[PDB]
Amino acid sequence: TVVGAVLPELKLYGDPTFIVSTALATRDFQDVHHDRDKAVAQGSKDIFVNILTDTGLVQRYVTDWAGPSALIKSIGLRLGVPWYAYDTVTFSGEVTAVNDGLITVKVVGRNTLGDHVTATVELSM
Amino acid sequence: TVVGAVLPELKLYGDPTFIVSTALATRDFQDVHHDRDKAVAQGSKDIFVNILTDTGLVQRYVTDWAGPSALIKSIGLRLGVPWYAYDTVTFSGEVTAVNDGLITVKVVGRNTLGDHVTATVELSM
Amino acid sequence: MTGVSDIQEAVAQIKAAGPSKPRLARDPVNQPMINNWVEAIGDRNPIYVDDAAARAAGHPGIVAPPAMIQVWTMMGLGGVRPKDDPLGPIIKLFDDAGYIGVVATNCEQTYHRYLLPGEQVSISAELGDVVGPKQTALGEGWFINQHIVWQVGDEDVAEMNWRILKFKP
Amino acid sequence: MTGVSDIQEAVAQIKAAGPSKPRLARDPVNQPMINNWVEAIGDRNPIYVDDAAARAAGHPGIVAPPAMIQVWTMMGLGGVRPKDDPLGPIIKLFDDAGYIGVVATNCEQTYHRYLLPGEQVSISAELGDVVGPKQTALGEGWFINQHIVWQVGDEDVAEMNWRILKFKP
Numbered sequence: 358t359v360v361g362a363v364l365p366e367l368k369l370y371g372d373p374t375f376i377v378s379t380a381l382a383t384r385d386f387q388d389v390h391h392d393r394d395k396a397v398a399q400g401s402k403d404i405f406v407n408i409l410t411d412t413g414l415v416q417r418y419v420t421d422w423a424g425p426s427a428l429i430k431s432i433g434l435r436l437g438v439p440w441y442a443y444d445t446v447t448f449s450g451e452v453t454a455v456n457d458g459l460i461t462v463k464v465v466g467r468n469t470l471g472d473h474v475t476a477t478v479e480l481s482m
Numbered sequence: 483t484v485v486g487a488v489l490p491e492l493k494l495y496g497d498p499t500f501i502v503s504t505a506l507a508t509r510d511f512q513d514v515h516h517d518r519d520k521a522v523a524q525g526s527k528d529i530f531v532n533i534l535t536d537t538g539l540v541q542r543y544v545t546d547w548a549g550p551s552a553l554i555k556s557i558g559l560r561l562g563v564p565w566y567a568y569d570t571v572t573f574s575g576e577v578t579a580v581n582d583g584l585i586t587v588k589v590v591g592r593n594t595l596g597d598h599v600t601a602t603v604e605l606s607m
Numbered sequence: 608m609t610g611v612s613d614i615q616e617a618v619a620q621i622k623a624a625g626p627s628k629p630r631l632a633r634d635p636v637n638q639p640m641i642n643n644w645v646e647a648i649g650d651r652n653p654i655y656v657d658d659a660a661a662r663a664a665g666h667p668g669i670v671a672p673p674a675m676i677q678v679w680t681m682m683g684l685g686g687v688r689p690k691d692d693p694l695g696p697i698i699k700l701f702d703d704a705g706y707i708g709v710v711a712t713n714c715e716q717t718y719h720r721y722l723l724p725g726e727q728v729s730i731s732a733e734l735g736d737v738v739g740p741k742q743t744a745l746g747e748g749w750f751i752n753q754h755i756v757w758q759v760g761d762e763d764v765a766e767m768n769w770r771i772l773k774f775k776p
Numbered sequence: 777m778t779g780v781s782d783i784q785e786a787v788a789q790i791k792a793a794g795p796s797k798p799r800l801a802r803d804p805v806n807q808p809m810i811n812n813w814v815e816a817i818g819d820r821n822p823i824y825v826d827d828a829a830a831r832a833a834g835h836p837g838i839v840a841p842p843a844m845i846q847v848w849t850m851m852g853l854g855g856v857r858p859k860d861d862p863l864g865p866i867i868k869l870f871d872d873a874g875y876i877g878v879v880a881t882n883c884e885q886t887y888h889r890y891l892l893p894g895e896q897v898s899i900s901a902e903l904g905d906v907v908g909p910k911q912t913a914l915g916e917g918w919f920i921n922q923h924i925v926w927q928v929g930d931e932d933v934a935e936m937n938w939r940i941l942k943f944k945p
């Protein structure tokens with residue numbers, strides 16, 4: 358691949374089943390990802406996607422494009438606006454670096470509230 | 483044990499985390515056990531405890547009393563009023579039969595709405 | 608098609624197809640899912656989590672909770688029943704006849720023996736008695752029984768007879 | 777006790793205790809929990825679920841998703857951190873100083889290799905740089921870094937550097 362190559366888009370609808378099932382599949386039982394009343398009590402609008410799911414989706418997004426042979430070396434997240442129930446995050450990608458067979462991808466996940474997550478991913482072929 | 487023996491009481495608070503975590507631990511992803519808006523849309527007051535969790539609690543309630551050596555032979559449920567978020571179910575028990583080393587227990591789970599579940603359990607020592 | 612004698616005939620037609628072909632559980636009986644379940648249910652019974660303890664009560668080693676039998680073969684997120692599951696045709700039949708509502712009324716499970724981690728379960732389903740029309744608190748309806756058998760290989764290890772009410776609201 | 781030079785001293789005191797003693801994951805890397813995760817995440821990468829496919833890409837057999845590393849050692853329902861986890865003291869320190877709010881800001885994970893079903897992971901945590909006080913959109917606060925290492929036995933297999941902001945709302 359080349360620097361400046363853009364990954365295919367991926368849009369994900371954050372319905373409650375998605376938010377709850379991903380949080381519990383990452384064994385994250387914090388009430389903010391499945392209990393709306395506790396989320397609201399703690400000052401959030403609704404339940405929201407957890408950080409481990411962010412990591413997993415970023416990983417998925419890059420291997421969706423790179424394919425099965427890709428070896429994920431690192432995933433770096435800068436956390437942004439919340440991904441609340443019924444919001445849609447759009448992942449966009451751009452290759453930023455290629456060197457010694459080590460690829461670096463900048464990933465941004467955007468929803469209605471703005472930039473939900475910014476990610477730097479390092480991988481092999 | 484003897485016919486007419488009463489089991490110790492067990493009260494369970496159905497907070498959302500309990501309702502959601504038990505449903506997903508029984509691999510029941512129906513939206514009525516974790517998505518309040520879908521539950522309300524389908525005519526329910528709130529999310530509610532699923533039937534597989536009922537079965538599991540009835541089992542737990544009887545082995546809590548009978549102990550580790552008990553062999554559960556059968557669990558029969560007659561389904562009653564819903565167990566909604568924030569309602570408390572009280573399990574009460576009564577031994578109804580003893581014969582040939584086969585014990586039969588009648589279990590009732592009661593909450594504010596009334597009889598949530600009625601159960602007949604058969605076990606060995 | 609049209610009416611009660613026709614509903615009886617359709618039920619008989621579904622039954623004539625016979626039980627669904629055995630469907631294998633996603634996973635064998637396994638300790639991580641046992642752990643998730645006893646964690647959430649709050650059942651501290653030692654025999655589900657401790658090999659040594661699952662012997663004072665007379666088992667070989669850790670056994671799965673009997674009430675987990677249905678968990679192993681749950682369809683999962685977004686799963687769709689196979690075509691030969693009689694549940695499908697029977698719901699479709701009664702929905703079309705106007706009995707659009709549904710509630711479960713009874714669930715009876717029988718456990719022939721305890722299962723061990725590593726054992727893999729299959730499920731087969733058959734239509735049982737279909738009774739109706741009857742007048743109920745929720746309206747006129749038909750009570751439908753389904754009979755489920757779980758096997759480890761060719762060994763019958765558990766079953767479930769459960770009943771739903773399909774009704775006119 | 778009282779003030780910034782004292783907060784710096786307290787941070788140094790926590791660091792002097794050293795990293796938490798390795799805590800073992802509830803389960804080994806295992807296929808059922810991999811299945812739950814790829815199911816929910818919607819990642820269809822064949823190497824997580826098919827031994828044969830986890831070889832065309834060059835692995836021995838099925839490998840766990842790298843991003844699952846933190847999942848294996850999650851505390852679980854109602855779990856409580858051990859006393860030697862520096863996270864505890866550091867939150868307590870800043871809460872008492874009035875920096876009662878918290879948000880995560882950065883999470884960086886490094887994967888030295890892929891893990892295989894059956895491998896069992898341990899986790900150790902250490903306090904990294906603590907920087908403050910700083911003026912932020914959420915108010916005055918301190919940025920706290922924590923450094924996590926995962927091992928299979930004595931082999932370093934992954935790490936996480938993550939950062940939180942403890943602030944006055």
Ligand SMILES: [Ca+2]
Nearest residue numbers: 719763765766
């Ligand atoms: Ca049988």
Ligand SMILES: [Ca+2]
Nearest residue numbers: 888932934935
């Ligand atoms: Ca390292």
